[PDB]
Amino acid sequence: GYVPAVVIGTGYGAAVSALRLGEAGVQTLMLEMGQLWNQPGPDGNIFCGMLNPDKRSSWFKNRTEAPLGSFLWLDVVNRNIDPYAGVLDRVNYDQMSVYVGRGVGGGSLVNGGMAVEPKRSYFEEILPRVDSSEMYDRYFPRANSMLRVNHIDTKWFEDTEWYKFARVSREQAGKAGLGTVFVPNVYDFGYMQREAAGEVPKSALATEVIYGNNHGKQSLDKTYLAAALGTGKVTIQTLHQVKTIRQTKDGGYALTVEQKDTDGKLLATKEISCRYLFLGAGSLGSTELLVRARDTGTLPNLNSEVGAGWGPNGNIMTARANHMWNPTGAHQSSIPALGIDAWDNSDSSVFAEIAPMPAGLETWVSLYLAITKNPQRGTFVYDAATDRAKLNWTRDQNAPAVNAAKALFDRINKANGTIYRYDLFGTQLKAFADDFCYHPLGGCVLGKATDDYGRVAGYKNLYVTDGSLIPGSVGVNPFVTITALAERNVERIIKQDV
Numbered sequence: 001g002y003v004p005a006v007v008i009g010t011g012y013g014a015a016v017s018a019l020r021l022g023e024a025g026v027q028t029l030m031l032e033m034g035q036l037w038n039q040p041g042p043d044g045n046i047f048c049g050m051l052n053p054d055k056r057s058s059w060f061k062n063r064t065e066a067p068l069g070s071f072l073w074l075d076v077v078n079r080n081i082d083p084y085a086g087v088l089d090r091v092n093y094d095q096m097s098v099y100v101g102r103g104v105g106g107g108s109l110v111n112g113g114m115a116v117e118p119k120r121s122y123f124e125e126i127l128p129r130v131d132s133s134e135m136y137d138r139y140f141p142r143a144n145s146m147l148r149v150n151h152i153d154t155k156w157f158e159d160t161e162w163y164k165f166a167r168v169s170r171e172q173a174g175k176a177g178l179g180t181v182f183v184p185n186v187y188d189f190g191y192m193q194r195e196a197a198g199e200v201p202k203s204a205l206a207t208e209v210i211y212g213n214n215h216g217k218q219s220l221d222k223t224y225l226a227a228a229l230g231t232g233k234v235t236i237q238t239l240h241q242v243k244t245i246r247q248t249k250d251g252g253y254a255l256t257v258e259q260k261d262t263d264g265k266l267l268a269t270k271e272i273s274c275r276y277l278f279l280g281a282g283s284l285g286s287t288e289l290l291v292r293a294r295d296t297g298t299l300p301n302l303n304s305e306v307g308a309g310w311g312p313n314g315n316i317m318t319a320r321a322n323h324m325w326n327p328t329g330a331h332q333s334s335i336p337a338l339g340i341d342a343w344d345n346s347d348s349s350v351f352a353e354i355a356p357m358p359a360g361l362e363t364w365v366s367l368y369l370a371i372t373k374n375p376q377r378g379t380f381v382y383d384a385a386t387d388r389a390k391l392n393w394t395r396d397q398n399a400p401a402v403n404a405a406k407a408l409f410d411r412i413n414k415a416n417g418t419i420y421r422y423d424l425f426g427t428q429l430k431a432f433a434d435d436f437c438y439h440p441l442g443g444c445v446l447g448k449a450t451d452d453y454g455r456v457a458g459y460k461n462l463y464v465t466d467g468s469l470i471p472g473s474v475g476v477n478p479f480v481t482i483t484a485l486a487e488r489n490v491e492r493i494i495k496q497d498v
């Protein structure tokens with residue numbers, strides 16, 4: 001069971017790495033714990049929508065859940081389900097719930113497709129050891145092109161009922177002296193226009209996104225992974241989860257990999273060895289594999305930085321109740337297109353996505369996913385008893401994030417005479433959701449747990465390629481940064497190590 005290169009996971013870091021490895025002539029095997037999402041379900045579609053969730057919506061849960069912010073309207077469609085290898089996984093830690101994708105393409109399957117480059121001045125602040133010129137002159141443009149990032153037509157956006165929710169918030173923010181910015185996306189906007197005209201099957205305009213899009217969204221399986229398979233040097237094995245990693249007696253790596261069926265039944269456990277090992281299991285997955293390896297003694301030379309520096313990208317969700325004369329619309333595209341930019345690198349910085357709501361009826365609610373600058377970091381500690389990495393993060397650690405998000409929206413509320421909603425996240429009268437995360441960043445920080453290109457400290461031919469490399473914050477939606485950084489890392493690695 002030997003393969004020259006093995007890539008764990010099939011998310012952004014993994015996809016970029018596998019493509020370049022394949023192009024360099026290196027036979028590569030990608031191991032993905034989730035499924036290859038290409039089989040039509042009971043409704044004839046691959047993915048379930050947000051108004052008709054079923055077992056495909058969740059990674060081994062016994063009941064469906066409403067998208068955060070829409071419980072009041074979507075709980076009615078929740079149903080009990082059989083634990084299944086679904087597409088969206090809500091990982092519950094002590095005081096933090098991290099949402100991640102499971103399947104070929106990782107988070108690209110369930111994300112909002114928002115492709116945004118971080119502010120250069122901020123990138124230079126968070127990663128001082130990295131050459132920012134190479135990043136902005138070469139790697140970011142490369143990522144933009146490969147990801148198939150596109151831009152919404154302004155005339156269509158301005159006239160369509162599907163983005164009224166966005167225009168309402170723009171107007172409200174404008175009164176507080178705040179401006180908005182268009183957010184590039186991997187969802188084909190031309191296709192979206194055709195959806196509204198009833199010319200093609202709807203996806204974004206049919207309340208679909210978080211459990212996958214049956215059309216329009218150019219997830220990784222269609223971009224990087226498709227190209228990787230096209231090299232003829234890359235293979236992908238699904239429902240294969242790597243459990244342990246060790247260094248063979250000669251410098252290479254051996255992995256224990258469990259193969260399961262969609263019901264989670266263990267079919268077999270196999271040994272896979274390789275020369276080059278790339279981890280792309282995400283901020284949670286890669287960090288867990290390494291903290292486990294260190295603490296169980298299979299990779300004893302890993303440093304103390306492994307597991308540290310985790311941050312939720314300052315993720316905070318909040319909502320405002322609009323005046324009766326400012327309805328947000330019953331028809332809201334599932335793909336965000338506008339955001340409020342109030343990020344200047346200071347502590348009050350906030351970059352907020354104007355989030356659509358799937359209710360399907362007028363609620364007058366404006367939803368926002370704020371990205372803030374909070375210095376608090378958590379640490380993944382290995383629990384040998386349960387063989388699980390535990391995230392040491394407490395809810396109060398998000399206080400700075402809530403404070404920044406509140407200060408911004410308070411300005412908008414003041415300028416418009418509106419108030420927050422306090423009932424969207426539960427019965428505790430909370431206006432700010434502070435214990436969830438869509439953008440997990442850190443755990444195997446670049447330059448700390450690894451060198452400046454992701455080479456894991458203490459080992460040769462061992463690499464980390466994903467969100468675990470980011471120092472807990474990027475100030476914008478993270479996948480373009482993860483992709484660009486991965487392009488930079490693998491190119492150097494192939495040149496010097498391979």
Ligand SMILES: Cc1cc2nc3c(=O)[nH]c(=O)nc-3n(C[C@H](O)[C@H](O)[C@H](O)COP(=O)(O)OP(=O)(O)OC[C@H]3O[C@@H](n4cnc5c(N)ncnc54)[C@H](O)[C@@H]3O)c2cc1C
Nearest residue numbers: 009011012013033106107112113114242285466467477479
């Ligand atoms: C609901 C939601 C909305 C978001 N919206 C946006 C957005 O619009 N724009 C944006 O920029 N970002 C967004 N994100 C975040 C973005 O999706 C993630 O930052 C990105 O996917 C992280 O890439 P990654 O390569 O680190 O890992 P991931 O994409 O998470 O992928 C890791 C992969 O490894 C697999 N895996 C894990 N452990 C193992 C193992 N042991 N063995 C085998 N396989 C393994 C996982 O199943 C998964 O497929 C969103 C995420 C969510 C949850």
